[PDB]
Every structure is written in structure tokens, then in C-alpha cells.
Amino acid sequence: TTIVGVKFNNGVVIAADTRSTQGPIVADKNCAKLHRISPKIWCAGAGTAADTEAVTQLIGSNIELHSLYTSREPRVVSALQMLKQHLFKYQGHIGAYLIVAGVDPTGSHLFSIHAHGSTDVGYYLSLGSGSLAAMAVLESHWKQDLTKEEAIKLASDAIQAGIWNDLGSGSNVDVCVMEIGKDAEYLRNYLTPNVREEKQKSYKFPRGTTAVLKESIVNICD
Amino acid sequence: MDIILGIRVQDSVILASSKAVTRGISVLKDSDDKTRQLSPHTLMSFAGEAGDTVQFAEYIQANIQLYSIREDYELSPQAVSSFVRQELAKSIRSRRPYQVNVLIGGYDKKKNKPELYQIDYLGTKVELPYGAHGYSGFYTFSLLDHHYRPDMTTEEGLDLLKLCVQELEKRMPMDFKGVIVKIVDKDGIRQVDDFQAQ
Amino acid sequence: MDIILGIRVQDSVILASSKAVTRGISVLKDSDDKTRQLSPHTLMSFAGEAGDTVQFAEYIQANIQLYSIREDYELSPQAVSSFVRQELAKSIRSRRPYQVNVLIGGYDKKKNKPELYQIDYLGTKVELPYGAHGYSGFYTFSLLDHHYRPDMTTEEGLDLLKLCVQELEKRMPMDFKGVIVKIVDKDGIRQVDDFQAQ
Amino acid sequence: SDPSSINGGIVVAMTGKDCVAIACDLRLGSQSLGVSNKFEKIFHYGHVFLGITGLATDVTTLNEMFRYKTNLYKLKEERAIEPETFTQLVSSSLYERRFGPYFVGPVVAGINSKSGKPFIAGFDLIGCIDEAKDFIVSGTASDQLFGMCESLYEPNLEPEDLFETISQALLNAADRDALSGWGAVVYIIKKDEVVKRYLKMRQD
Amino acid sequence: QFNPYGDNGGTILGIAGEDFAVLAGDTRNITDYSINSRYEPKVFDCGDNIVMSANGFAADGDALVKRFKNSVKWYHFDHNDKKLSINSAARNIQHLLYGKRFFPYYVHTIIAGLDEDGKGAVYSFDPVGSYEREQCRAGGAAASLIMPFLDNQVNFKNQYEPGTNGKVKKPLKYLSVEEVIKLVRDSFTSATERHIQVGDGLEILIVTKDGVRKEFYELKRD
Amino acid sequence: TSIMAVTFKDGVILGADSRTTTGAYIANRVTDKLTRVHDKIWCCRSGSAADTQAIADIVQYHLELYTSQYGTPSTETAASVFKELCYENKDNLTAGIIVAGYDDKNKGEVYTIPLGGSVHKLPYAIAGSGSTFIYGYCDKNFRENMSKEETVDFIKHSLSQAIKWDGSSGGVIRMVVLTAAGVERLIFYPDEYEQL
Amino acid sequence: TSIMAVTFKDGVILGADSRTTTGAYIANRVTDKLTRVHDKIWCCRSGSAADTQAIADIVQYHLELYTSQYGTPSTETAASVFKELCYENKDNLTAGIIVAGYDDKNKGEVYTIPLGGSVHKLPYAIAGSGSTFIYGYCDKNFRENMSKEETVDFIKHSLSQAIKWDGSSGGVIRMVVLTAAGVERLIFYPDEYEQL
Amino acid sequence: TQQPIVTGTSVISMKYDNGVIIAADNLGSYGSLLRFNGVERLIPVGDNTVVGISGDISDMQHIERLLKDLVTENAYDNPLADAEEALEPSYIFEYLATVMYQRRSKMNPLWNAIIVAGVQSNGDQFLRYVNLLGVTYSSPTLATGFGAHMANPLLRKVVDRESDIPKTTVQVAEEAIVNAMRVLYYRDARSSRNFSLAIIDKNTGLTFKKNLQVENMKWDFAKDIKGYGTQKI
Amino acid sequence: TTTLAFRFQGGIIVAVDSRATAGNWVASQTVKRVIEINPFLLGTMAGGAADCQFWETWLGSQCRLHELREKERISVAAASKILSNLVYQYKGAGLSMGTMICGYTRKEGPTIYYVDSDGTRLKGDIFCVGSGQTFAYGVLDSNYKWDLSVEDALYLGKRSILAAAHRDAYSGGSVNLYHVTEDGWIYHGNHDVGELFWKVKEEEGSFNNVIG
Ligand SMILES: [Mg+2]
Ligand SMILES: [Mg+2]
Ligand SMILES: [Mg+2]
Ligand SMILES: [Mg+2]
Ligand SMILES: [Mg+2]
Ligand SMILES: [Mg+2]
Ligand SMILES: [Mg+2]
Question: For residues B182 and B13, is the Cβ–Cβ distance under 8 A?
């Protein structure tokens, strides 16, 4: 769990690692903490996984229904308000913190919601265990008005921060970009710093090493 | 806990079940049958929480008998035990679970073979050659693993079981006041009432 | 708890004491004498905490025998029990108390009469016609209140006691594995070893 | 005070070049006392496979619940449930009971009858989806399994070899876990044919 | 209240080679979800061709080693620099360790070397004193991820001779040091991949009839 | 947490910090603790984050709805709305919340709805994690109503010292001017107040 | 509880209230919280009653014994004596204790030995149940050293507001003037400070 | 057992081509209060050592005493006390550690996180942690309690490893370490603005750079933030 | 853990498993649970490794002192008593340990004393301690007789321990066997349960329920 988001002169970018823990164990070496609420509004979420997903699924689901009916377009705060009204209706019992971000027919947007109903706003937000390292990085290298290149470069180098100095996070980097006029590009694994080196020996076994007592050919259809 | 045993043999099943009843200190009845015949060929021994026990059994019993006259056709041991497990499965997540463990012995007439199902209060079922809920297994399971053969006669089984008992007596702290034994077969149910003089 | 009985009669005293030993679940030995002759005419049955029990008894024993050869004169049941109580009295306010209850049976040779003292681990003594530590009293005390007579023969006593036993078996949850019985009289101590075939 | 850890059991799956595999132990018992050695944690719904670890009744209840639903799907849709589809389902299902969770650890795996693409997944008791391309492990000895799999998985094995690998992976991790064993069984899923095998192991 | 204990991760490993011995164990050091030092040795030579290592709680650990390295020194002073047969050292440690029975040393300790015949020898320790002559033991956080493996690879557990049906188990054979170190590195990498408390580097002390050798190999800074 | 609201001759102005802390860490050192419910009615949130946030949302709703039928509402008419919310749920709520608003007629009013739900119209109120040291200053250095700029200092120095001794409260200062004129959005960067 | 000590041009003077509370009740609303250890060395006790009282007694002893052989002792020489007592026993002691003393040479010194045992020479210190609201005033309204009468006011007003917002601290005020001149025993009755 | 009363926050440090650095603000907190705006957290020992202490001041003050008191104790009967035979950093620390342990081992510790820095007579860099638990470790970078979570990150961007020390200029060390100090003040309630930094270079020696301010901060952008989601105007 | 010992016509028989275990994971299957106190005595190992191991060796020393003083073999009863007294010294402190102290003296004949951390000294003819103590007491109770072929006694021991191993998850590995006589003890090697099981089920015909 280590994520951030930073808006530039014509949009906003959120990134998150790809490692999911489980106490001291690594469950998934490749997970996507970046989910789509709607084409232009996306989320990154930390804390309790199943919570974070299902919840966006829910909201994305409704917001679609909304836009259709309204014939207009998805506003960012619509998503925000939806989330935190339900989110808090369950006074904390749904651990999910997240950086909600997208673009609506009125501007670029970026917010952070806590698991209890708290919502904030700034130009850059970090949520997760390594929220401190990636915070420290953005709190020295940030200047108003950065570009598709400046901002990007940064976001990814913030994430990198957590990946290294914090245990609860690792593997590759996930990124998504929303531009005030343009589309949205999902870049699964913009980076790949961590890669296992080629092993020492070949562990493939010689056929027939395992002892078998019985065997057959199980059934399927009618 | 109490004693509940059961063993599947040749063309029958055998259920053992201690007789004593305890209220903290004194022992009230000591000639108590923890049994309840569900249908002519199905039977169920049980042990569990004081009230939870006898209520649940009768209740299960009710449903069955109902089904059996409604349909006029009898229900199979397999399916029976499935339903019992169903009920306990819910029971466990109910506002108040019936804390009760059971053994279900029956003679499946279509297969013309005897089946025995062990089921704990959590709703955990399994067809077995023999079983025992609670601490009862620890003391005996070995002897069974040892001498048991699928082909044993009805008598062979009794002897075995009889031996398991002698052991339970010898190393168990509690005085279970003996056992009532019963047999389910192609003929139905009868009680080995003789296990007092035997 | 275990079983510790004692009954004073005509020109003797009788001590009963269950035989089983338990470690949580299994039963180790079941032919265990919870006795310890202190002197030729004094004797002590006991029940208590697992370690506390057997250590204390022997320790008490030691002191006595010591006194008895030093002086060459034997010590009186009365005085003995006084000392035991002393030790426990201190024991109870010690950094760690020996949790142990006891019965002390002896034949006071000067008075030519049998004395019996019951004493709990708190250091509570009392000369009694009969007694039993722990839950043991509850089940029996009545029968004794009933049939007991000071004049009873040695045999009379056994029968009584035997009846108390049959009861303890019938209404006690635990299996005490029988009892070892013993008699203290003008002749000294002997064991009614026959209470297995009797 | 953990439920998952009461009954025992493990399940593991791997993806080979054009096929899959999934195996589990056989033991079932209340903590110390072993009870059964014929209790299987793997079943299927037509061509889809599910392995479930965790709490025994909850396992059974789930199988029943799924057999139920897949039958009803295939009926109104005149076609058997697809892997990817099933996943998304069993996922939601677990969640519907997010406040009275089922104490289990499922693992799905199969072969998509259209693309022909091998599939594997794993989830926590509430339906969080773990999409993987190598292996999935759930159960008591979860940690021991990752130790095996990490060494032994080799991208794209031949079915005949994959069997040998997974077998050994399961088999060996099972011996360092006190609560799993008493036999095991491995299935090998090809486009068409499927082979079930029981293996010999320590019975302690 | 005051909690006098702590965990600093770490994983060590000891294999008793036919006529050698290895004691490997990584260089990472942790607290909660943070890092302390990328490089921090847990394995040491204590002279008399004897290696040690105590993993669990650093402080109790290094104190024991220190407390031991001194007890070796004093052994020479009183017996005219007689060499400490490894077996002896262990009986000695038992005591040291048992000295603090009712306030133990929160650590799994291991030593390795050679007996009075030239055979490799490892020794695993309880956190209070029980010692066993092990020919192979992994202790530490990752423990349960490597022990299953060596089980298999080092003792060919569950591996039979093909075509024998399952009647002929594959015979053990003793592997050269090279062979062993290949196994060991693989073990650790696999472990680092799936265990957060493990990574960074690997320092190996190899014992042989003419000294102590040290070889290091870098792991992933995941 | 560190908020307040002060009344004077042209009305009333409320100000607060930006610092919000989760444990000894700074979550967002740039908080808009001052919140708008109606055009000439605002409030400063104290205590719990999530709670205070949602309360407002609801209130904002009631009022923006009141107007559409019962005309424009008072400042007292607004306080009572929080009274209800705060009270009813005193068990699942942590809120210090201070309310302020102006109306040409009754000038600007100041009401504090502290924890529990008890309401108060005072000359000026002060709540929040670091209110504890300005009981000395505030009360003592308080003249009955002042001038626009004249008042801006009470705010300025009251707020300044509160940062100086209470870590849980800090960041920048932010004021909101509610007058006949209208709303004015203030902001006093660090190197300033510290100098004083 | 509400004490302190302030230094200036002629030395230093320490003052405190009289109010001591057991629960919400006033045990003795007339306490001599200012205590003498040596002729030109005194102290004001904070926190626990029984403890602070006994500490002093001991110290008074050490010093009155020091002199009889090592001449007259410093103000720093005295603080260290409390340092030991306070520290060693931090587990069975509750003491806020502020120390003050004067010597012609180094003027008057102010040291505070708060809970824990940490010692401090400051311009002036303030401890006690109600110190919490004068972090605003004190610091802000503090000119480097003043005059006898000039200073008497810091004391007077700092102490006044502390009564005004902290019930656990009240009663009358009492000051102790330590100078070249000598010791002067002050006392400012109620109707006075309240007026201010 | 016991509990901490007054608290020193963090203490950051790192090595470079010639020597080492160690900073630590001058704040001693009393819970959430800041009862002490200017307090010393850096005791230099000899002229080749300094000790950044973080935790309880009452305890920290005790140690100081143990140092000065140990220092004055080295002199005693030994002429070379200012050259050949004189306290190296490695020593003090060794003795320090020894102590911290006996303490936890006696169920009564000193609530402190400590860093020992300096340079060995023979020219080597020294940097080692040691806390109330009696735990220790070397590393190119080191920070107490709050530091390590937030400082260490940046300090590791300058020196990812031991193979970078040789090429770590005294100036690059400084500015970076101060940027870190700005950050510690940006997001930590327990931190102060005034502080004390110290350098121990094998060439120049000890350079106690006491009392400084943290300058250059981007706050302006504050004005742009309004509400928390909807609040526009 | 499953340890046991019993007396018979030929002397004493001791049998153990070898599975150590931390929580759910198996820490080792190579455990020596029989403490060779000295050439003529043996102590089993229940309770907690270090305690049994340590004290029982301490005890071994103690005998050597006595014996040398007396120029006579130390008698079981005493040896056991001593351990007991030492253990009692620590009742309350947290010492945990079950154990059979077995010997065969000139006079005493074969003799077992079960001893535990609670100070229970117990003379007996059969003892099982551990997790599997329950299943092992099964096989033993039925099959025991005092006149066993020296070899059958050895076999009973194996099989008994084997029952426990199968069922009791916390017990297993390999079995260790020792026989004791008037002139000292004799090891009867190690037996991998894995291999052995398959053998027994085969020869003995027992363990039917098991597949394959
Ligand atoms: Mg990491
Ligand atoms: Mg697991
Ligand atoms: Mg196993
Ligand atoms: Mg030697
Ligand atoms: Mg502040
Ligand atoms: Mg007052
Ligand atoms: Mg087992």
C-alpha cells in the first residue's frame, strides 16, 4: 500500500505500486491499485483491498447510470460525494483510503478520502504505508505548474521512494493520466525496476518421480 | 462431554452411547437413551449442550416422519444426513446455535448397503466406517484403526466395540455408567438390550 | 478433589482413600495408596495439590520418627495432630502454602482409646467420630449421621463405610477406581487388603 | 482463536503451456485429532474448477451454493459458466456476506472454451481477487507453499512435467505443516481430457 | 507498561556438509515497517574454527555472541590454549543460555564447524537451551519457506527412483561445497521474493579444515 | 485544531489555521477549516474530521432549501439547525464547531455549539485543540467591538501564540470577512505572525 | 495549583495562589505554597501535596548542613539538590516544583525542575494546574527585566487570569521578594485582581 | 518500567568523503505542549565526537553527566590524554551501549534513541545507533524515531550504498541534510524551527554550527486551496 | 509429542517420536527425546525440551558423585527422588515437564518412575505422556502381557507409538527405541514413520480404511 497523485498545468496523474502484502507475506507480485470509476475519473486506493475495489465498482456502476440518465457528463465531485456519503454511513467499518482523481467538463480534479468520511484537497496527495517517504519526495521537488513531463517524472519517482525505504510496497509501478482536453491512458507497469535475477540451478524433475496410487479420467458434461 | 460411538460393518451399523446424566455434581438418571429413531431404517445418537440436545433431535425427527408419510416413500440415509447438516449450517450462524454433535446410522435399501455419517455442531459431515464425537475418539480410534475390517460380521463388531468400551472405562476419568447399544440393518432396528448381562 | 474418609469406632479407627491418579485427561496409576504411617500406632491419609501432597506427608513423617527414637517414647495422636496443625498454620501464611488436607488416625495407648482428627490445609483441626475432606462429605455424611453408633465393632464399621462407598460410586461423577482401607488399633496397623475380593 | 486454522488443509494450482493443474491434501480433523482422509477440497461445475480451504462446513456449504447457481446459469443461458465469469461471481458472493464472512480460501482455475486461455485465481474470505499467471496457494501451509512454488514454477511446462512439479510442491510443503496431509490428489486439465491422480505420502 | 523485547527480522541457515559446514544469513535489519541498515552482519567467526549467529532480537543476540566469544577466550587461559571441540562449545552455550532461563535471550541461535573426526557439524538452539545436532537447519522469519525446500533438495524427500513404481526412494549422495552454495543462494532469493522482512544481501561463512572463508552475494532491495 | 470568530462594528470575521494531525503527523497542513453554509453564514470546524465535514453538508442542505420557500434565514435560525444535529447524536459525534453570520439588521452574531450540543451567543468564541492558552490574552486584550483592520490583529496574535505552544495546531492563517460589503478571503503567510 | 518565579534588575520574586483542592472541594483555601529552604533561596511547590512538602524538608536539611562547612551555597548548587531527589524517585513522585534564589554576584537565578527531573534555567518559569492560559500573556507581554514595582504586575495579572479560568487554582495571591535588600512578604487580597 | 515525560524528537545523520554530519532541532516537548523552545540535544565529546540524543530530557541530561564525568575520568593519570591516549568515538559508544543494556536488563531503561558520530584517529568515519533497548547498527544514514520514517528516504537518494561515500562532497551532504530538516518541520507536530548541526571532518575537525532557522518555503500556493470538495467561493 | 515406557518380564522398553513444533509449522523431525542420563539410566521428554534436557543431564552428574562416594550403583528410587526435590524447589516458577526415569538395579529389579514439573513422583509399570499419550495407551492396554518375547515387547512399543503418530498431528517423524537391562541400556535404532507405516499396514493387515 503506497500511492500518490499530482495535477499539472493541463490535468492530473495518479500512481501506485503493484505489491499486496498479508502480514509479512507477499500475496500478489502484480496487482492494480488503480481502478476505473469512469473514463475520466479514476481511483487509487490503499488499506483493505476488497473494500477499495468493490466500493469503486459500486460507485462507477452508479455514476454510469447517472450520466446516461442526465445525458450530460461525470463531474468529479459527484464521485467524491457519492463515495464519502456511503463511505461514512458505515462509520469506519470499511477501511479504504484513496486518491480520487479525474477530469470533468469544468476542470482537472484531485482529492483524498479517508476511511471514515474525511476528504481533503491539495495539489498532491499520498496514501498508504509508505505515505511518508513519497510525501518527503514531493515536499522538496514540487513547484506550481509542472508539465506532462515534469509531473509524471515526479509522481513515478515518489512511488519509487516507498518501493525502496518501506517494506509494505514493491515490485513495479502503475500509472494513469488524464489531460484537460485529451483522453486517458492506462500504463500498466510504466516501470519494472524489481525483476528477479535468473536462478542458479534448473529445478525441473525427471518424469515419474512422484508415486501414484490411482488414476482415472473424471467426467464433465451431460 | 458424553460418549457417542458408531461403527459400520457388513450389512449393518452399530451405535453406542453412554447412559448417565449429570447436573454439575450429582448424577440424575443413569439409564438414559441418547437415541431417537428417525425412520424405520434410519437412527441418530447425539451428545451436546443440555437443552440444545433433546430438542433438536425431536425436531429433526418430526420433519422426516412428515416427509415419509407425505411421500409414502422413505428417505435415504445419504439425503437425511444432508438435511441435518443443512439445518446445523444455518444454526451455527443463527442468533443462537443449537450446540450439538451427532452420528447417523442407516441402511440404504436401494444400495442394500449400510451408511454411517458423523456430524459436528458446526455443520461438519463425513461418511465414515466408524466414528466418535468429542474426547471419545482419542481413547478408541487406535483400536479401531487396528482391528477393523469392512467384512466383519455383526457379532465381530460388538466384540470390538466391547473392547473399546473396556478401555474407555480403564483410562477415562468420568464414570459414564455403561452403554446402550443398537443395530440398524435390512430388518430395521433392535436393541442389544443384552449388553448389561454381556 | 479425591476421596478421604475416616471413622472412629470401638477400639479402632478406619481410613478409606481412593486409589486413582489423574493428569488432566488420562488416568496414570489406579492402585495408589494415599497413606503414610507416621508411627506404629499413628497413621495419616491425605488429598491435596499434586506436588504439595506427597512431599508434606513424608516431611511430617520424618519429624515424628525422629522424635520417636530420640525419646524412645512414642508421641500421642492428640499431640501429633497438634503439630501437624502448627506446621500448616505457618504454611498458610508462607510465601507458598502446601495446599493439602488430611485425616489422622491413631490409638492413644495411655487412654487405651482411639482418636481421629480431621484437618484442612488452612490449619483447621477437630477431633471427630468420623470425617471426610472435600466433596466427599456431602455424599456420605448423612448415612453416617444416620447409622453411626460409638459402640460399633470393627466389622460394623466396615459395613457402614462399604455402604457409603456404594453410594459415592452411584452418585459421584468421577471414577475413583475403588478404595484402600486400613485399621489402627491396640495391635497397630494392618490393611483390609480384602476390600477388592470384598 | 482462529477458525481457518481449525480443520486444516491446503490447495495449490499452476498454469502450464496450454493447460492447468490443481491439487490438495486430504486430511480433515478438529485441531489435533485427525478425522478423515477422504475429504476432497476440489470439485467442478462442468469445465470449471474450484479449490477451497478453510473452515469445513463453510467449504461444503460453498460447494453446494455454487453447484446450485452454475446449474441455474447454464440453464437460462444454454451454456456453461465461463472461468473469468465464475471468478467475478464467487467474488461478489463472498462479499454479500462481508459482515458474517465465510472463513475460506478459494482458488479457481480452468480453460476458457473460446479463447482457449488457461486461468487461475485466489481470494481472501471476502472476495478480493488475486489474478496470477504462475501459481496460487491457500490454506494452512500457505507460507510453505510459496517457498516451493517460487523455486519450482517454470513458465510453460509440459502437462506431464507440470504434474511432477506441482505434485512435489504440494507434497513437500505438506510435510512441514502439521495440519495437512493424509493423502492428496492432483488433476491435470487439458483442452479436452482431464486426468485425476492420487499420490502416496506419509500418513502422519 | 514497558516491553523489553523486539524483533529485527533476519533469517540464517546452517548446512552440515560432509567435511565442511556453512552458516549463511542475510544482512538486513528491521523495525516495524522501516529499515535500519542495508548491511549488518549476523554471522561471526569466534576463533577455533567455529561460526555463530543468533537471530531474533538483535541486542539479546549480539550480547550472547559477545558473552560467548569471551567464554572461549577464558577457556584457553585455564587450559593452555586447548582447542574448543565444537561439541564442547555447544554444551557451554546451553548453560549460558540457560543462565537466563526466567528472562531468556529472545533468539534462535546456531553454530557450525567440525567434530573431532573432520566431519561437518551444525547445532541448532532453543531460545533457552535445548540443542540438537542438526545436519541442516534454517531459523528466522523465512524459516518456513526454505526448510521445506532443503527437505526436498538436500534430502530428496518425497523423490523416488522412476520405474521402480514408488518402491525405491532416490539415494542420498554428498554434495560438494559449490553444490551447496548454489542451493543456498536460490533458497534466499525465493525467500526474498515472497518475504518482506527478507532481502538486501547474503553473507556466507564457510568452514573447512584450514579456516573460515567469507563470500557475499547481493540480494534484492525490494 | 485552532478556530474562532469575532464580532465588531461592520459585523464579524472568523479565522483558523490549516494544520490537521493524525497522531503526531501532519495529514494536510493546508486545511480550509472555514466553511460556508449560506452566503452570509459560515462556520469553523473543530475536533473530528469526518464528522464535522458531514454535519455541514447536511446543514448547507437544510438552509439552501429553507430559503427557496421561507426567504433568507437568520444567524440564530442557523445555529438551531446545528443544535439538533449535534444534540441528537452526541454519542457518535466529536465536534467543537463555532458558528457565525451577519444580517444588516442584527449586525453579525456569534454562537458556539461545543461538544454536547450546548449553544452560546457570545461576543466572540474560540475552540480547537490550542484554544487553551488564549484565555489569557483574548479576554484581557478585548475592547468592545473594533474596526475592520483594528480587529484583524486580535485574530492575528491570538492565532499566532496558539501555534507557538500547540503542535497539533499550525500551518497558515485564513480569515473570512463577512460584512455589509460582502465576503473577503484573507491569508497570512508564516514569516509574518512569528515575527510578532 | 498555580505558581511561578520571575527575575529582573534587583533580583527575582516568586508568587503563587493559596487554593488546594481534594476533588472539587477546597481543603485549605489559604496555602503558603511559597517555601523557604535557605535565607536567599526559596521555592514554589506544584502538583502533589504530601510529596512536595517532604522533598523540601529534606533539601532544607542538606543546605542548612552544607553551609555549616562549605560556606553559603549558590542557587545552582540548590537546584541540583532537587534534581537528585526528583529524578531518583520519578516513579513515586508528582512534583512540578520551581526553584529561585539570589546571590549579589550572579543576580537572581530561576530554575524549573518539572515532572521527570529535567532542570532549567530560564528568564522566568510557570507551573501549576492553571499555567495553561498564561502561555499567551506571559511570553507576549514580557520585557527583558523590569523594576521592583514594574514587575509586581506581571505577577499580579498573570496570576489574576489563571484564577478566572481555572477553578483548581485560586484564593489569595502571595509574593516573596528576594533582593539585595532582603526578603519582603507580599499579599494581594481578591477584590483587587478581579477588578483588573 | 516508567514513562517518558519531556521529549526530544528526531536526530538525523550521514557520512561523506571526509567525515560525518548530525542535526537535531532544539525542542523539548511536554506531551502536546512545547514548554521548552531552546534546548541542547548535541553533546560533543572530546573534539572527535558528538552525541545526538532523542527521547527523555531528564534521562538525556543524566548521560551528559556520564560523559563529562567519564571524560574528566580519562585524564586521571595519563599524560597522552590529548593525543595518543584519548577517547575515540568507538569507545564512548561501546561504553554507552553497555549501559543501555544493563538497564533494560534491569527492567528500568533510559527512554532514548542515540547516535554516536565522529572520526577515528586513524581517519575512519563512525556512525552508530543505540536505543533504550540496547540495540545498535551502522549505516550510511541514521535517524531517530521520527526521522528514519521521513528523513532516511532522501538521505538514501544521496547514498543508496556504501559505494557512494567516497564521492559525497561535504556541501552536497549539508544542503541535502538541511532540505531534510525543512521536511521534518513540514510534517511533524513534535518538531522545532531552531536547531543545532555539527560536522566532524578529518581535515577541518569539529564544527558546532549552533542555532539556525529553516528558510525557503513554498506556502504561497496555500491561497489557492478552498473547501474540501465543493466549497467553491 | 508421544513418549512412553513400560516394565516387563525382560526389563524396560522406551519408545519416542521426534516431532518438535512451533504453532502450526513443524520446526524439526530430528528430535532426540530420550536423555541418555548415563549408561544405566534414561529419561524421556515431555513438557518443555530445555527443562527435561538440562536437568536430566544435571541429574546424570549428580549420580556420578554419589556413586564415586559410595563405590556402589545409585538406585533408581533415589535418582528419581532427587530430580523431584530439585523440581519442587521450582514449583511456581514456570518449569514444565513430564518424564519417565527408568532403571534396573541389583535389588529393585526393573522400575519406572514417572515424574513431572509439579513434583509428582510415581512408581509404575506403564506410562505414556504427551499429546498422543491417549492413543498409545490404547494399543498398549489391550496388547500388554508381562511375558513378552523380548522382540515383541520391542514391537509393541513401535506400533503403539505408531498409532499416535498417525492420528496426533503434533506427533510423528521417526521412532526411537531403547531396551534396558541389569547391565545397561541398548539402542534399537531409528525408524522413519513414513516408511514403517506402509510396512505395518502391509504385514499386519491393519489400517484398512487407508487408501492404497
Ligand atoms: Mg520495500
Ligand atoms: Mg495460510
Ligand atoms: Mg504433515
Ligand atoms: Mg572438548
Ligand atoms: Mg503549532
Ligand atoms: Mg479559581
Ligand atoms: Mg500426526
Answer: no
Q: DSSP secondary structure string, I195-212?
A: HHHHHHHHHT---TTS--
- Ligand with an atom nearest the CA of residue D4: 2
CATH number of the CATH domain containing I12: 3.60.20.10
Instruction: State the total domains in chain E.
Output: 1
Residue among B141, B148, B167 whose CB faces I167 most closely: B141
Task: Tell me whether residues I138 and B148 touch, CB distance under 8 A.
Answer: no
CA Rg, chain D, in Å? 16
Q: Assign C162 to helix, strand or coil.
A: helix
* Interatomic CA distance for residues F126 and D81, integer angstroms: 64
Which CATH entry fits the domain spanning A1-222: 3.40.1190.20, 3.40.50.2300, 3.60.20.10, 3.40.50.300?
3.60.20.10
I78 known ligand binder: no
Q: Is residue E72 within 8 Å of residue E79, measured between CB atoms?
A: no
Grid cell 590454549 in the structure block, residue: E81
Count CB pairs under 8 A between chains A and H: 51
Question: How would DSSP label each residue in E35-69?
Answer: EEES----EEE-STT-EEEEEESHHHHHHHHHHHH
Q: How far is CA G101 from CA G3, G52, G86, in A?
A: 15, 18, 19
The reply to whether residue I25 touches residue E144, judged by beta carbons under 8 angstroms, is: yes
Provide, for chain C, the percentages of residues in helix, strand and coil under a 3-state DSSP scheme, each rounded to the nearest 5: 35, 30, 35
Cβ contacts of residue B18 below 8 Å, gap of 6+?
A: B2, B3, B4, B34, B176, B177, B178, B179
- Which of G139, G164, G165 is opposite residue F161, by nearest beta carbon? G139
- At A191, the amino acid letter reads L
Q: How far apart are alpha carbons E148 and D169 in whole angstroms?
A: 9
Which of helix, strand or coil describes residue C183? strand
Q: E164 C-alpha vs ligand 3 centroid, how far in Å?
A: 25
Our count of domains for chain I comes to: 1
| Length of chain A measured in residues | 222
The DSSP bridge partners found for residue H131 are H113
Angle at alpha carbon of residue B132, lines to B127 and B137, rounded to 5°: 120
Which residue do the cell numbers 464467487 mark? D90
Task: Using an 8 Å CB-CB cutoff, list chain D residues near E193.
Answer: 150
For strand D194-199 and strand A212-216, is the pairing parallel, antiparallel, or unpaired? antiparallel
Comparing CA positions, the residue from A10, A16, A29, A20 lying closest to residue A156 is: A16
For residue F6, the distance in angstroms to the closest alpha carbon of chain G comes to: 18
**CA separation for the pair A80, G102 (Å, rounded):** 65
**Dihedral over Cα of F85, F87, F93, F99: its sign:** positive
Output the nine-digit C-alpha cell for G157.
495579572
- Our measurement of the distance from residue E165's CA atom to the centroid of its chain's CA atoms, rounded to an integer in Å, reads 37
CATH class (in words) of the domain with range D1-204: alpha beta
Q: Which CATH superfamily is domain B1-198 in?
A: Aminohydrolase, N-terminal nucleophile (Ntn) domain (3.60.20.10)
Q: Tell me how many domains chain F contains.
A: 1
F30: which chain H residues are within 8 Å (Cβ-Cβ)?
222, 225
Closest residue by Cα to residue H114 from H163, H74, H62, H161:
H62
Ligand 5 midpoint to CA F2 (Å): 10
Catalytic annotation, pick one of G1, G7, G35, G52: G1
Q: How far apart are CA E42 and CA E29, in angstroms?
A: 10
Strand pairing partners for G3? Answer: G16, G127
- Residue found under cell 475403588: C178
CATH code of the domain covering residue F102: 3.60.20.10
- Angle of helix F49-70 versus helix A76-89 axis, rounded to 10: 110
Name the residue among D59, D86, D63 with its Cα closest to residue D74: D86
CB-CB neighbours of I48 under 10 Å: 17
Q: Report the alpha-carbon angle H168-H171-H174, nearest 5.
A: 95
